[PDB]
Amino acid sequence: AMQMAYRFNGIGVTQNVLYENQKLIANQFNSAIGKIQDSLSSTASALGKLQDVVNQNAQALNTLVKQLSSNFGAISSVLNDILSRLDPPEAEVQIDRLITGRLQSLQTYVTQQLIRAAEIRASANLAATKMSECVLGQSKRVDFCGKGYHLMSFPQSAPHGVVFLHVTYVPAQEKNFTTAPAICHDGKAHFPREGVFVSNGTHWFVTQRNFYEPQIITTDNTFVSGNCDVVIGIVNNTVYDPLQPELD
Amino acid sequence: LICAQKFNGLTVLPPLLTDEMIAQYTSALLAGTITSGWTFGAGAALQIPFAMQMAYRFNGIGVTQNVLYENQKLIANQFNSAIGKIQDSLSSTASALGKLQDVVNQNAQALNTLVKQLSSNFGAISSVLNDILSRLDPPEAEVQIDRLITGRLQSLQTYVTQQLIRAAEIRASANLAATKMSECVLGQSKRVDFCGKGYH
Amino acid sequence: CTLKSFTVEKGIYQTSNFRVQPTESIVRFPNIKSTNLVKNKCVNFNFNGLTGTGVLTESNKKFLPFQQFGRDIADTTDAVRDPQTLEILDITPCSFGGVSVITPGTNTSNQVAVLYQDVNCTEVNVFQTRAGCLIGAEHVNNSYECDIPIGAGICASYQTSQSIIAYTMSLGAENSVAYSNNSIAIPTNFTISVTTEILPVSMTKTSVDCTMYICGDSTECSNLLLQYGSFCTQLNRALTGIAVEQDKNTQEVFAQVKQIYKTPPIKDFGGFNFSQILPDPSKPSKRSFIEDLLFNKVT
Amino acid sequence: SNLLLQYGSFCTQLNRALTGIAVEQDKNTQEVFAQVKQIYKTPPIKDFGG
């Protein structure tokens, strides 16, 4: 639980939203893993990449091994036939034609294999990077380790490949508020330390940028800078100044 | 030169996404990044006044936000002047779009070489199949036609190999561009000197 | 017949090409047998030995009084002078087009649509596109998500009492955020989401022998092949390079921990249920559940 | 066309390979300009703080 709190705290969402929503997050995570279970083991086969490798290798091998049955100009397609059917001083030219043909075919096969191997090398390096950054730590490259704010990841093996389950965070039902970038309380503008100002219509609050949780504007969530005569859109208001009640 | 190239079975398929769709895509990305900042790349779209998003982005690089809200007009003027400088710099120098010109040039050059390859003897007595047929008999014309076939086949092989290599390189560049689109546009980056030059 | 199968899956495939055919064979001889001239037809021609086929049209380019042929950047005869009537013609070759076929899959229906890649199809339901023309599909005015790409922004689908439809694809739902200089939108609830991402790591480490493939277990074939000495030694070197590269790939992607951590036998993980991804000792091997699910769907 | 049947499996190679490349091209664009489920329009007001 504390590690999940540490991982929330890395996307600008304070911990108190986790420790107070533990059951709900557990339930959502379990339901999601069940959905991914049901989505894999179904007729909706989504493993196209891992299958393309096998299919392309099989097709290349089949074409190469079928190339053995072409005359290329010679009088046969099997060496033993020409060997038992002709004398060497004549069989030389036919065997030579067959040799050039099969050698050209082998050359093309090797070249195609080299290129596809380079492509797979590129993909494997990308996979290594993703495994090192998404799994062994939380990432902040947007849309690299999932879709949304990334929380964690779990790898799973697969034939001739790897499969990442990215567990990511995505916000939900929102609300419209009226904002303002400053509060001229007493001639001095008060900017927010970390959050953003909102107004439910009459009052004002400061809240974190990713989860509506309205606090009260004090001299502890804000900081003063300059006079309230230069910021463009600023609204007069009051600040709590928490020392006055207890000190008096 | 388009149809002349086309006149030997060498056709050019049209792209799937016509230019209007790409324009709509880029306009969508712009509108999203200037009316919602980055949240439109991580779920729904949440609007936010542009000045406040810019203050978020300053806070991202260490500079507290009281710097922006006290220099808004100056920063807007610098931004506008910079955009104007960009527009002017494009409309005057020709060597700006070097890369995108290099691709077109190399593709057209490969195609022209492939076409001009169809006019050499390769050891035969001519480069016109109708000619060799109408001037010789099968038992002695088959060797000529074999020479020509081998030569043209070899040229085609070289062309396909060149295309494969170039396509691999452009695929690498397109993956790089996709990463830049995902990490620079849809959100502020911090990989130093990745998404520009300086703090981003 | 082309795919070498009895079941075809949903998509676009390519059969043989298409070629317009010569409707007439004209010839031109000097005044010393000659035949009549024809225009605007996909025809053969002959000009004093000069042989070819195309669309003999009237030229607009002013020759010089001694010029017969005409050419271009690609050096293709596209103008000739008439040795009978002293006329300079145009030429535009005619054999053009690939033939493809759209099919929703031979598990759903035996209906198909044909597509000619660059033809106005005044040749051979008909619907013209920007990417050739499309026979057998019916055009609509809606806009859906793309299912089978045609080109130039045209996508074809099967759903409709069914028929093949071909429409202009749509990018998505078009909305407008109510942006206002003092308006903001703040979330109130969240949602975890577990997505997947697939990555190929290594292909099958193959290997070929030079002489056992080019030759059989022959003798004079090897003694002939020894005239191309250093070819297939190089080939085998390249292939072993690829093999060791695959091995290194797997090593690098997975071998990133020096220890082998065992999870404790308890599962007091704050409330989460990892039972579907941690290994199961009851299994014969040591694979987990989703590992097996993946391992079965690759055949 | 008859003498070319002495090599035939070559050509069904080439086309195939080329088509691969062709398809991949569209895929490329689908990765770059396709990351927004929606299509946004900026409002007709141009009050962007300056």
Shortest distance, CA D50 to any CA of chain A (angstroms): 11
**D16 in contact with C at a CB cutoff of 8 Å?**
no
Q: Inspect the interface and report whether the beta carbons of C180 and B47 lie closer than 8 Å.
A: yes
Residues of C in contact with A50 (CB under 8 A): 198, 200, 298
Where do the DSSP E strands lie in B9-111?
none
The whole-angstrom distance between residue A1's C-alpha and the CA centroid of its chain comes to: 24
Q: In angstroms, rounded to a whole number, what is the distance separating the alpha carbons of residues A152 and A134?
A: 7
Q: How far apart are CA B133 and CA B107, in angstroms?
A: 34
For residue A111, the chain B residue with the least C-alpha distance is B161
- Rounded CA separation B3/C247 (Å): 49
Residues in chain B closer than 8 A to A209 (CB atoms): 56
Is residue A145 within 8 A of residue A153, CB to CB? The reply is yes
Angstroms from D48 CA to nearest CA on chain C: 8
Residue of B153, B180, B185 to mutate for D, most D C-beta atoms under 10 A: B153
- Chain D CB contacts of B51 under 8 Å are 49
Q: Are strands A205-207 and A196-198 parallel, antiparallel or unpaired?
A: antiparallel
C-alpha triplet A168, A174, A178: angle, nearest 5°: 130
Query: Are A144 and A134 a contacting pair, CB within 8 Å?
Result: yes
Going by C-beta distance under 8 Å and a sequence separation of 6 or more, which residues neighbour residue C260? none
Given a contact cutoff of 8 angstroms between Cβ atoms, the answer to whether A112 and A60 are in contact is: yes
**Cα torsion C244, C249, C251, C252: sign:** positive
Partners of chain A (3+ Cβ pairs below 8 A): B, C, D
The letter for the amino acid at D35 is: Q
Answer yes or no: do C175 and D40 touch at CB < 8 A: yes
Burial code (b: 16+ CB inside 10 Å, e: under 16) for A164-177 equals bbbbbbbbeebeeb
Chain D, nearest residue to B150 by Cα: D4
Nearest in space to A152 (alpha carbons), one of A35, A4, A28, A2: A4
Is D49's CB within 8 Å of A232's CB? yes
Return d(Cα C153, Cα B20) in angstroms, integer.
9
- Contact flag A179-B52 (C-beta cutoff 8 Å): yes
For chain B, positions 128-157, list CB contacts with chain C under 8 A. Answer: 128, 130-131, 134
| Amino acid letter, residue C197 | E
Q: Which of C74, C182, C187 sits opposite B49 (nearest CB)?
A: C182
First-to-last C-alpha distance (Å) of chain A = 41
Q: Which chain A residues touch D if contact means CB-CB below 8 Å? A: 63, 66-67, 70-73, 101, 108, 112, 143, 232
Distance from C-alpha of A122 to C-alpha of A125, rounded to nearest angstrom: 5
Three-state SS for A133?
A: helix
Resolution (A): 3.4
Judge residue A79's burial from the number of C-beta atoms within 10 Å of its C-beta, 0-12 exposed, 13-18 middle, 19 or more buried. Answer: buried
CB contact under 8 A, A226 and B38: no
Please tell me the experimental approach by which this structure was elucidated.
cryo-EM
Helix (H, G, I), strand (E, B) or coil at B37: coil
Q: Give a three-class secondary structure readout of chain C.
A: CCCCCCCCCCEEEECCCCCCCCCCECCECCCCCCCCCCCCCEEEEEECCEEEEEECEECCCCCCCCCCCCCCCCCCCCCCECCCCCCEEECCCCCCCCEEEEECCCCCCCCCEEEECCCCCCCCCEEECCCCEEECCEECCCCCCCCEECCCCCEEECCCCCCCEEECCCCCCEECCCCCCCEEEEECCEEEEEEEEEEECCCCCCCCCHHHHHCCCCCHHHHHHCCCCCHHHHHHHHHHHHHHHHHHHHHHHHCCCCCCCCCCCCCCCCCCCHHHCCCCCCCCCCCCHHHHHHHHCCC
Residue keyed to tokens 């050059």: B109
Give contacts of C 277-296 with A, CB under 8 A.
277, 287-291, 293-296
Burial class (CB in 10 A: 0-12, 13-18, 19+), C214: buried
- A74's tokens: 């010679």
Instruction: Specify which residues B92 forms β-bridges with.
Output: none
Residue D13 touches partner A, C-beta closer than 8 Å: yes
Specify the DSSP element, H or E, that contains A167. strand A161-171
Count CB-CB contacts under 10 A for residue B98: 8
- A-D Cβ pairs (cutoff 8 Å, strict): 17
Q: Looking at beta carbons, which residues of chain B come within 8 Å of A140?
A: 190
Give yes or no for D49 touching A (CB within 8 A): yes
Nearest to B42 among A142, A181, A231 (CB): A142
**Minimal-distance CA residue of chain B relative to C148:** B16
Cross-chain residue pair C184–B119, CB shorter than 8 Å: no
β-bridge mates for residue C45, sequence order? C52
Name C122's Cβ contacts closer than 8 Å, sequence gap at least 6: none
Burial of B141 (0-12, 13-18, 19+ CB in 10 A): middle
B61/B56 Cα distance (integer angstroms): 9
Element (H, E) at B35: helix B19-35
Nearest to B7 among C76, C117, C175 (CB): C76
Cβ separation B11–C117 shorter than 8 A: yes
Three-state DSSP class for A144?
coil
Please, are residues A116 and B161 in contact by the beta-carbon 8 Å criterion? no
Best of A80, A176, A206, A208 to disrupt the C interface by mutation (most C CBs within 10 Å)?
A176
Q: Select from D4, D31, D40 the Cβ nearest to the Cβ of B149.
A: D4
CB–CB of A150/C275 below 8 Å? Answer: no
Q: Rounded to 5 degrees, what angle do the CA atoms C208, C209, C212 make?
A: 130
Q: Do D42 and C178 touch (CB under 8 A)?
A: no
Token reading at A11: 């996307």
CA distance B67 to C194: 40
Instruction: Find, among D10, C238, B126, the residue nearest to A63 by Cα.
Output: D10
Q: Estimate the crossing angle of helix B138-180 against helix A88-130, to 10 degrees.
A: 10
CB contact under 8 A, A181 and B51: yes
Interface of chain C toward chain B, CB-CB under 8 angstroms: 17, 51, 72-76, 78, 92-93, 95-96, 98, 117-118, 130-131, 149, 151-153, 169, 171, 175, 177-187
Subunit contact B50:D49, Cβ cutoff 8 A: yes
Q: What is residue D40's three-state secondary structure?
A: strand
Q: What are phi and psi of B25, to 5 degrees?
A: -60, -50
Contacts of C180 in chain D (CB under 8 A): 45
Query: By C-alpha distance, which of B115, B104, B125, B105 is closest to B155?
Result: B115
Q: Which residues of A touch D7 (CB under 8 A)?
A: 70, 72, 101
What is the full DSSP assignment across A21-74?
Answer: SHHHHHHHHHHHHHHHHHHHSSSS---HHHHHHHHHHHHHHHHHHHGGG--TTS
Q: How far is CA C228 from the centre of its chain?
A: 36
Of D4, D32, D39, the CB nearest to B181: D32
